[PDB]
């Protein structure tokens, strides 16, 4: 049909063909001929994964040992495996092989917080520094199977640290630099890391950040950490190093040579742990294999973004999150292109920094979160005209829904109606892109991620019946019908939590946690999470974890945290608190509690003080009532006589109306 | 036609394989007739490189190629096969079949009480082996470690052995009937880092105290860092030691159903198997050579095809369960029946109920069991449909012509082939046996030597090989073979003193045998400076009025525990001048 | 024609290889003439990938292919060869020759007193090396560990090194003449998990205190968990520490005559060898596995002209690089017998070397000019008592050889019928740098002549730091690019390595020596600067 009765996003939406200038700027024949070749390749990646991914794994990756089986396992049994029998090394495929080919080609284009401190590392430079850091870790006893934590800002040392760890066959666990001491402690202890790599202080927005200080605070309770490597980011001599545990990056790396043999690992040996928040309260360490994850990175980076050897990628992300892992580090370095590592903010020294960077290095591909696009539209639209952005041809959006208006703003003001826009939908647990418009191939509907990617058999499940929905113009739970190379393989030392979360809810499928809709053309429209996980400015948060931090305050008895829409951050956290026995004073105190328990980025937008929370006959909190109230749907609550304290609802409603502003 | 030495063979008609064997055979037999067998055998002796090289590639999956098929000599105790090659045992027993057909049955587990019986597919087996391997790996188990197993004959024993071999470590299986002291000795000699066991066992309906005996042993086993305990009975009164003991179900739940197998060298030890007035010695088997011997013997002697189902009524506590309940059949990708209980529980028809239930085609048992069932449950055999069987194996002890006939008629219905298999823990796999559907049987004779086994009879007095037939003597083997044991753990000298030095240039089985005019071997049971002495005879001469040890000059020395000179002369004039003890 | 700078070169007639060399040669020479050598040399400089790749395949057995022949630069101290490949040193030096012909001799052992001499075949060598590795494997020694050796020059020293390399560990040989303080400094720097030594030694008929010195040093060596002690004299009053010291014979009896060798990466360290430098305490020179082995095999073959039928007698000691490269690896890699001499040139008389050469029909002899000066002074008359007609290559090493000693070496030992190879190299080069190839390069007494494959020699002006073009020149000797057997670091002190070798003249390797180059390109070593 032409009209949609379910997918209202799609009604009267004109397709947006790739502009002709995209192809004029393309350095070579595109990797895909047209949308028909894409459909053929897609159908093969579903019907015949062995014949499709086998050759691609050989083309894009360098192997130390061949694989005998392309694909094994099933979602329902949680035993997925790819490229069995094969051996390889991640740092070899990202550094060594490119350095041998051309050691002088740029690899890390590092733009520091303050541009005066920017620099460029070639592949030859990167090989030597990765080798030396790996040499230090090796002399410390790090070996295949160990885990090493990283607590660094978004700069060269973070990338070097990750690649040095993977060079030895160990798994890195990168901890976002905005995390508090308690969040560091939790992640390090769950992984039992033997070593940590960090720095003395950080630079953000021109202001100094206390990085080593928070490590010392967490490490008092991290008995498994034997040694710490400290990079002199500020060289502030007043930063204390603990004798026998802490050692300086520059001093130790000077003892070792600029080449170290990489350690061969199995395709399914763990490459890294990345701790993610879910519906649990405690963060869960998502584990990724080596071969499957790397192939997914190279494959998506190449085909969805249309990356060629001549190109330059600026992923405005942070390696503390999956987007930096896959599309600032592994994706581009696997393909041998330069990648821009930006340490600062889009506002420093002014709101043209992104564009100053793009113009400076003639970047061809730009990848950013819609939260930033909203900021630059609100505060820095006047800066764009100062910069030449004609080197760009691919503009990616990631991590949250992109509104059609922001899509248009991105298309016109950054791309000049001349670039292809790739709204990429995916997750930490998927490793790489799931649904995205391939650059130069897929026509765009603003606000739609369009078609599923190679190896991704997407489906919609009816939330009522648990049955897959045939046909288009449909809505439901977004699930995937078979595993794919870059799919996460477990939750570290807690594979049962992994099964209960992703595989068991919809047996036979993978459960994304998201709902979506499919229009008459097969285009998917993401409709946000269905498991009440909150995404604030691109950061996955656990409302359960925020409730725990608020309760830790001994003046608080009960806490209930929900998420609502926000014009700036996408979603905002609303915290409801009941006290046992101050005003904004207490509310400010609680916000700071969340800041130092989890991290500044998890602070609630607002704190509502209530006499008590609505609870069932059981004694448990009905959070549905707090969600309906917080979204000004006070009506639609329904019959509340099932509660044990229905009189509380009135107080909840009035408190939200009185305290959300103030 | 007449024998003056091998009296067993006089007037024994050959017993051709019944026609029903071939009617029940799922495919064309692997060997056409005895003449083809003789050609293949002669090559496996004269040209081991050209014979075993191709078979090693056919029957095994390799992670790294081998550059030399065969190396070393018996006289130097440096035997090695497929040098340079790398592989993994659990990959060849599980992974490769799971990829091919994950739903094909692998372990048909018959519990002590049938209500608890279940079937694991190759896909199921891969997941369970991977999860246990993940637990052990997170505990620090790695190549070169030894891990003890103290479990009954059930799925967990099989899973545990394969998970240990998946990491490149060596499993040391300890028969679940052993005492605390027997556990203690074996664990300490092997210096095991971990132990896998269960809380209690079920045998004949009665509960056995398994974990309790382990705790008693482990008080003096400092090398054991952690123990994995399976809830076989879930008896809550069974104590676990904080910080050491962890539950199988709890820990395996933390890890995924796939774990990369760890490649090992062809000559890396696959397992240690301790023997029962001697002190227990850990017989060590290589990885590649042992596996090939298992697959090769299982395939050709038993005539195993992919469609078949093997019931080895043995226990992994002994070599028979190791090779023909686990490795042999799983290497070939067939189902294997793991029976936890006794032949009497819940009644004396259980074996036959099991064979009927799963339509087993191959049955392998010790004459001791056949004597029991003949004495107490003969009437139960006919109650069950046993027409799926075509091969009936006997192992571990001589099968008398009388028992052979009873086995042939009441179990086989004069329609099956009987394979009297002779071998030892140290040989890894069959040495002398009638190939099913190929070799005619003489009841009580193991018949011909197997591929790669150059059998001979040695005069025990002179150490000289006996030429010709109608002969008797010490059973010895003239060259090493792929599945031959490689050492005794951390005691290679005892290995040399036992197998290689008594008759230098040969392997000494410890058994006597006779060879008749047709070449059939008849096992006849167990038997200083080149002169053989009898410790028993020196004790007798001294009593009318002794032990052996290694010696760097005279090879071995005899120590017997004015009068000392009188006794030495007594032994010289009773036995012989060269038979005097070194010291009295 | 005339030299104004290289005064050593004026009026020095070339000395061609005697005819009897080519008569005693068992097979067609590996290089026909000097002109073919220069075509090969120029390829080894202009095309290292195309020259050394095939030679790496030809001379070494691999467990994994390599993907890149050469990587890195002198200026960044990140040189690497045969990247991605794996192999094992003991497999190439023992196993593969045992399989081919186990009865061929490998170690021709001449003890301090000849009555105790014996010969190990490659089959015998493999069984012994396996048993010792089996001992170390059971002790926890594994790839990445370092194991110290404190043994005289005899079979056990050779066996211990090969057994340590069989497991993928690095052996740190400590010359048996070192004091306890020297042992202490070396063992601690390397953090050795185990030590292999003996109870006592035999040197010139006298007993030496070996275990006693180890015990005095080990009181300050916490990392050493276990010690393996060989019974050289079997003196029962030698104390072994309970729980730490075990006997060689007692432990090897427990293990089988074969053990699988452990694969190591091309650039995994094969050994540490501690040198005395101009800067304080000893420094652990580290050598790769593939690069070093290729260099040892390639130079042994082409400079000495070694063939399968030949027998090499390197009268050195494995405490030093000369014994590492040319008493052990070089010859064993090529599957020829090597003569391991424990005693002195003086005991029981000054005809010991020659009695050995005659005894075993040695075709190659390799010694330091210090021994030549000793024998010239004291043992010249003994040379005529022994048949030395099997020799055809006479090597000099470790120090300049004066034209006088050269002539003496040439006439009384070589009988004016042998070729003389004055080899110049260092511990840090792994193998020969400059030497006259046997049967190829005519000699100028006192000159090492031309650089070897992959060695791009040059002279630098010490004052200006600029390479000196043209011949008839003097200055600091340097190399313009790294070579396969070049040392890769100083253990846990890569900065000392960069400061010593790579930084003085960036872009070059600094040999620490001064030299001169004459109009014919022959190099004249002028000693340390
Ligand atoms: C990537 C990343 C960060 O991964 P993660 O931090 O795991 O968050 C994953 C969740 O982010 C949301 N999301 C991500 N990309 C889009 C998109 N293009 N359109 C709409 N929603 C999107 C969904 O809710 C995902 O499940
Ligand atoms: C198998 C097994 C268990 O191996 P193991 O427990 O080592 O006992 C090995 C000894 O068993 C006896 N034996 C084994 N098979 C037969 C046979 N077919 N006919 C006669 N005797 C036999 C011999 O004495 C063996 O040396
Ligand atoms: C080999 C070795 C031992 O290596 P090492 O002990 O490091 O000493 C190395 C130094 O010995 C001197 N040297 C070595 N060989 C010669 C020679 N043929 N002609 C002149 N001088 C020589 C130089 O000074 C070297 O740099
Ligand atoms: Cl005994
Ligand atoms: Cl006597």
DSSP, collapsed to helix, strand or coil, labels residue B515 as strand
Please calculate the CA angle A530-A535-A541 and round it to the nearest 5 degrees: 95
Residue A262 has φ and ψ, to the nearest 5°, of -70, 150
Question: d(Cα B568, Cα B579) in Å, to the nearest integer?
Answer: 9
Task: Compute the radius of gyration of chain B from its Cα atoms.
Answer: 24
Task: Please give the number of the atom of ligand 3 that sits closest to the Cα of C422.
Answer: 18
Q: Which helix (H) or strand (E) holds C226?
A: strand C226-230
**How far does Cα C468 stand from its chain's mean position?**
31
A525-529's contacts with Cβ under 8 Å and 24+ in sequence apart are A525/A7, A525/A9, A525/A10, A525/A447, A525/A448, A525/A449, A526/A401, A526/A425, A526/A435, A526/A449, A526/A478, A527/A475, A528/A401
For domain C7-512, the CATH class is alpha beta
Do the beta carbons of residue B137 and residue B176 sit within 8 Å?
no
Sheet holding A474-480, edge to edge: A458-461, A474-480, A510-518, A524-529
The CA distance from B84 to the nearest CA of chain C, in Å, is 8
Query: Using CB atoms, which chains have 3+ pairs under 8 A with B?
Result: A, C
Please calculate the CA angle A22-A27-A28 and round it to the nearest 5 degrees: 105
The CA-atom distances, in angstroms, between C154 and each of B563, C93, C112, C119 are 49, 17, 9, 11
| Helix axes of C48-59 and C34-46: crossing angle, nearest 10 degrees | 110
Pairing assessment for the beta strands C364-367 and C393-396 based on DSSP bridges? parallel
Supply the DSSP string of B173-203, one letter for each residue.
E--TT--HHHHHHHHHHHT-SEEEEESEEEE
Half-sphere exposure of A565 (CA within 13 A, CB side): 10
**How far does Cα A281 stand from its chain's mean position?**
19
Residue A450 has φ and ψ, to the nearest 5°, of 70, -125
A-chain residues within 8 Å CB-CB of C72?
A: 258-259
Do the beta carbons of residue C131 and residue C233 sit within 8 Å?
no
Residue A565 has φ and ψ, to the nearest 5°, of -65, 150
Do the beta carbons of residue C447 and residue C8 sit within 8 Å?
yes
Please calculate the CA angle C116-C118-C119 and round it to the nearest 5 degrees: 165
Question: d(Cα B392, Cα B47) in Å, to the nearest integer?
Answer: 31
The CA-atom distances, in angstroms, between B312 and each of A95, A429, B328, B335, C412 are 54, 45, 11, 11, 79
C204-212's contacts with Cβ under 8 Å and 24+ in sequence apart are C204/C112, C204/C343, C204/C344, C204/C346, C204/C347, C205/C112, C205/C113, C205/C347, C205/C348, C207/C233, C207/C235, C208/C152, C208/C176, C210/C150, C210/C151, C210/C152, C210/C176, C211/C238, C211/C239, C211/C240, C212/C238
DSSP, collapsed to helix, strand or coil, labels residue C163 as helix
Scanning C167-303, the segments in alpha helix (DSSP H) are 180-190, 211-218, 248-252, 290-302
Give burial (CB, 10 Å; 0-12/13-18/19+) of C443: buried
Contact A254/C495, CB-based, under 8 Å? yes
Question: d(Cα B174, Cα B190) in Å, to the nearest integer?
Answer: 12
The CA-atom distances, in angstroms, between C519 and each of A463, C3, C453, C475, C524 are 91, 8, 20, 15, 12
Q: Is any atom of ligand 1 closer than 6 Å to the C-beta of A399?
A: yes
Question: d(Cα C239, Cα C224) in Å, to the nearest integer?
Answer: 17
Question: d(Cα C215, Cα C238) in Å, to the nearest integer?
Answer: 11
Q: Which residues of B are annotated as a binding site?
A: 203-206, 320, 396-398, 420-425, 511, 526, 529, 532, 572
Spatial neighbors of A146 by CB under 8 A, at least 6 apart, are A168, A170, A171, A193, A194, A195
A-chain residues within 8 Å CB-CB of C83?
A: 96, 100, 261
Q: Which ligand is nearest to the CA of C274?
A: 3
User: Residue A204: which of A348, A322, A314 has the closest Cα?
Assistant: A348
Q: Which residues of B are annotated as a binding site for ATP?
A: 396-398, 420-425, 511, 526, 532
Pairing assessment for the beta strands B86-87 and B264-265 based on DSSP bridges? antiparallel
- Residue whose CA is closest, atom 19 of ligand 1? A401
End-to-end Cα distance, chain B: 51
CB contact burial A266-283 (16+ within 10 A = b; e otherwise): bbbbbbbbbbbbbeeeeb
Number of residues that this document lists for chain C: 529
Sheet holding B507-515, edge to edge: B455-458, B471-477, B507-515, B521-526
User: Residue B93: which of B310, B309, B294 has the closest Cα?
Assistant: B294
CB contact burial B215-238 (16+ within 10 A = b; e otherwise): bebbeebebbebbbbbebbeeeeb
C-chain residues within 8 Å CB-CB of A256?
A: 489, 492, 494
Give the dihedral of Cα atoms C425, C427, C431, C434; nearest 10 deg.
-10
Sign of the dihedral defined by the CA atoms of residues A606, A607, A612, A613, in that order:
positive
DSSP, collapsed to helix, strand or coil, labels residue A458 as strand
- Which of B76, B266, B490 lies closest to C257 in CB terms? B76
Residue A336 has φ and ψ, to the nearest 5°, of 80, 25
Count CB-CB contacts under 10 A for residue B4: 8
List residues bridging with B557 in a β-sheet: B549
Question: d(Cα A277, Cα A513) in Å, to the nearest integer?
Answer: 12
Question: d(Cα A447, Cα C123) in Å, to the nearest integer?
Answer: 75
Question: d(Cα A318, Cα A331) in Å, to the nearest integer?
Answer: 14
Q: Is C400 annotated as a binding residue?
A: yes
DSSP, collapsed to helix, strand or coil, labels residue C421 as strand
User: Residue C166: which of C59, C261, C254 has the closest Cα?
Assistant: C261
DSSP, collapsed to helix, strand or coil, labels residue A556 as strand
Q: Which ligand is nearest to the CA of B577?
A: 5
DSSP state letter for B522:
E
Do the beta carbons of residue A197 and residue A177 sit within 8 Å?
no
- Residue whose CA is closest, atom 22 of ligand 3? C399
- Which of C68, C77, C493 lies closest to A100 in CB terms? C68
- Residue whose CA is closest, atom 22 of ligand 2? B397
End-to-end Cα distance, chain C: 28
| Helix axes of C155-166 and C122-138: crossing angle, nearest 10 degrees | 60
User: Residue B328: which of B283, B362, B359, B351 has the closest Cα?
Assistant: B362
Question: d(Cα C197, Cα C228) in Å, to the nearest integer?
Answer: 6
Q: Which residues of A are annotated as a binding site for CoA?
A: 204-207, 323, 537, 595
Question: d(Cα C524, Cα C161) in Å, to the nearest integer?
Answer: 34
Task: Compute the radius of gyration of chain C from its Cα atoms.
Answer: 22
Contact A139/C492, CB-based, under 8 Å? yes
Q: Is any atom of ligand 1 closer than 6 Å to the C-beta of A138?
A: no
Pairing assessment for the beta strands B118-121 and B105-110 based on DSSP bridges? antiparallel
Half-sphere exposure of B224 (CA within 13 A, CB side): 30
**Secondary structure, 3-state, C366-388:** EECHHHHHHHHHHCCHHHHHCCC
Spatial neighbors of A139 by CB under 8 A, at least 6 apart, are A255, A256, C492
- Which of A65, A79, A493 lies closest to B257 in CB terms? A79
Residue C348 preceded by cis peptide, ω within 30: yes
Do the beta carbons of residue A54 and residue A70 sit within 8 Å?
yes
Greatest pairwise CA separation for chain A in angstroms: 73
In angstroms, this model's resolution equals 2.8
DSSP, collapsed to helix, strand or coil, labels residue C44 as helix
List residues bridging with A518 in a β-sheet: A474, A524
Sign of the dihedral defined by the CA atoms of residues A140, A146, A151, A156, in that order:
positive
User: Residue B85: which of B75, B71, B103 has the closest Cα?
Assistant: B71
What was the structure determination method? X-ray
- Which of B61, B254, B257 lies closest to A78 in CB terms? B257
Contact B78/C258, CB-based, under 8 Å? yes
Contact B126/A79, CB-based, under 8 Å? yes
Question: d(Cα C349, Cα A325) in Å, to the nearest integer?
Answer: 73
Spatial neighbors of B462 by CB under 8 A, at least 6 apart, are none
Do the beta carbons of residue C346 and residue C374 sit within 8 Å?
yes
CATH 3.40.50.12780 fits A8-513, yes or no: yes
Task: Compute the radius of gyration of chain A from its Cα atoms.
Answer: 25
DSSP, collapsed to helix, strand or coil, labels residue B68 as strand
CATH of B7-510, one of 3.30.300.180, 3.40.50.300, 2.60.120.1030, 3.40.50.12780: 3.40.50.12780
Q: Which ligand is nearest to the CA of B318?
A: 2
B454 CA → ligand 2 middle, Å:
18
Do the beta carbons of residue C178 and residue C275 sit within 8 Å?
no
A535 CA → ligand 1 middle, Å:
8
Question: d(Cα C396, Cα C406) in Å, to the nearest integer?
Answer: 9
Do the beta carbons of residue A218 and residue C458 sit within 8 Å?
no
Pairing assessment for the beta strands A490-491 and A284-289 based on DSSP bridges? antiparallel
Domain limits of chain B? 7-510
Supply the DSSP string of B485-500, one letter for each residue.
--EETT-HHHHIIIII
Beta strands in A185-269 (DSSP E): 195-199, 201-204, 207-210, 227-231, 246-248, 265-266
Supply the DSSP string of B442-499, one letter for each residue.
-TT--BSBPTT--EEEE-TTT-PBPPSSSEEEEEEESS--TT---EETT-HHHHIIII
Give burial (CB, 10 Å; 0-12/13-18/19+) of A20: exposed
The CA-atom distances, in angstroms, between A31 and each of A334, A393, C20 are 16, 15, 69
Sheet holding B118-121, edge to edge: B118-121, B105-110, B336-339, B310-312, B362-365, B391-395, B417-421
Question: d(Cα B247, Cα B258) in Å, to the nearest integer?
Answer: 20
List residues bridging with C271 in a β-sheet: C171, C287
């Amino acid at each position: 049909e032409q009209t949609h009765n379910v997918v209202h996003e799609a009604n009267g939406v004109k397709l947006r063909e790739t502009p002709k200038e995209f192809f004029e700027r393309q350095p070579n024949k595109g990797h895909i001929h047209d949308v028909n070749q894409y459909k053929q390749m897609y159908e093969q990646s579903i019907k015949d994964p062995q014949g499709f991914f086998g050759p691609l794994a050989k083309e894009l990756l360098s192997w130390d040992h061949d694989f005998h089986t392309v694909k094994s396992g099933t979602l329902k049994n949680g035993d997925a495996a790819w490229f069995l029998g094969g051996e390889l090394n991640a740092s070899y495929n990202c550094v060594d092989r490119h350095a041998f080919a051309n050691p002088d080609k740029p690899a890390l284009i590092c733009e520091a917080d303050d541009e005066k401190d920017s620099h460029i590392l070639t592949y030859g430079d990167l090989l030597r520094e990765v080798s030396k850091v790996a040499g230090v870790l090796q002399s410390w006893g790090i070996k295949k199977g160990d885990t090493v934590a990283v607590y660094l800002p978004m700069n060269a040392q973070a990338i070097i640290a990750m690649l040095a760890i993977a060079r030895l066959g160990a798994a890195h666990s990168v901890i976002f630099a905005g995390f508090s001491a308690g969040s560091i402690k939790d992640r390090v202890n769950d992984a039992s890391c033997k070593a940590l790599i960090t720095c003395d202080e950080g630079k953000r927005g021109g202001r100094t950040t206390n990085i080593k200080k928070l490590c010392d605070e967490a490490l008092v309770d991290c008995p498994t950490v034997e040694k710490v490597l400290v990079y002199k980011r500020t060289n502030n001599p007043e930063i204390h190093l603990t004798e026998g545990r802490d050692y300086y990056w520059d001093v130790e790396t000077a003892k070792f040579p600029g080449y170290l043999p990489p350690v061969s690992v199995n395709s399914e040996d763990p490459l890294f742990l990345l701790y993610t928040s879910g519906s649990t309260g405690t963060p869960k360490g998502v584990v990724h294999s080596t071969a499957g994850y790397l192939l997914g990175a190279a494959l998506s980076t190449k085909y969805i973004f249309d990356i060629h050897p001549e190109d330059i990628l600026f992923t405005a992300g942070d390696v503390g999150w999956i987007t930096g892992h896959t599309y600032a580090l592994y994706g581009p370095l696997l393909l041998g292109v330069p990648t821009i590592i930006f340490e600062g903010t889009p506002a420093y020294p002014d709101y043209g920094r992104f564009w100053q960077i793009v113009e400076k290095h003639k970047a061809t591909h730009f990848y950013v979160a819609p939260t930033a696009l909203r900021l630059l539209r609100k505060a820095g639209e006047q800066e764009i005209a100062k910069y030449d952005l004609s080197s760009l041809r691919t503009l990616g959006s990631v991590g949250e829904p992109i509104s059609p208006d922001i899509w248009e703003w991105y298309n016109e003001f950054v791309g000049k109606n001349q670039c292809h826009i790739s709204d990429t939908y995916w997750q930490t647990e998927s490793g790489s892109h799931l649904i995205a418009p391939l650059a130069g191939v897929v026509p765009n509907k603003p606000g739609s991620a369009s078609y599923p990617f190679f190896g991704i058999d997407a489906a919609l499940i009816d939330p009522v019946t648990g049955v897959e929905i045939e046909g288009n113009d449909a809505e439901g739970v977004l699930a995937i019908k078979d595993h794919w190379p870059s799919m996460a393989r477990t939750v570290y030392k807690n594979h049962t939590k992994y099964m209960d979360t992703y595989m068991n809810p919809y047996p036979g499928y993978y459960f994304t946690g998201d709902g979506a809709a499919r229009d008459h053309d097969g285009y998917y429209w993401i409709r946000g999470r269905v498991d009440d996980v909150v995404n604030v400015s691109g950061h996955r948060l656990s409302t359960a974890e925020i409730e725990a931090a608020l309760i830790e305050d001994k003046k608080v008895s009960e806490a209930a945290v929900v998420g609502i829409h926000d014009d700036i951050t996408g979603q905002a956290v609303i915290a409801y608190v009941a006290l046992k026995e101050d005003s904004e004073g207490l509310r400010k105190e609680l916000v700071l509690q969340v800041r130092k328990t989890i991290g500044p980025f998890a602070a609630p937008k607002s704190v509502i003080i209530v006499q008590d929370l609505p609870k069932t006959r059981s004694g448990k909190i009905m959070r549905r009532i707090l969600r309906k109230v917080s979204s000004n749907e006070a009506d639609q609550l329904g019959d509340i006589s099932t509660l044990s304290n229905p009189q509380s609802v009135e107080g909840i409603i009035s408190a939200f109306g009185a305290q959300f502003g103030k």
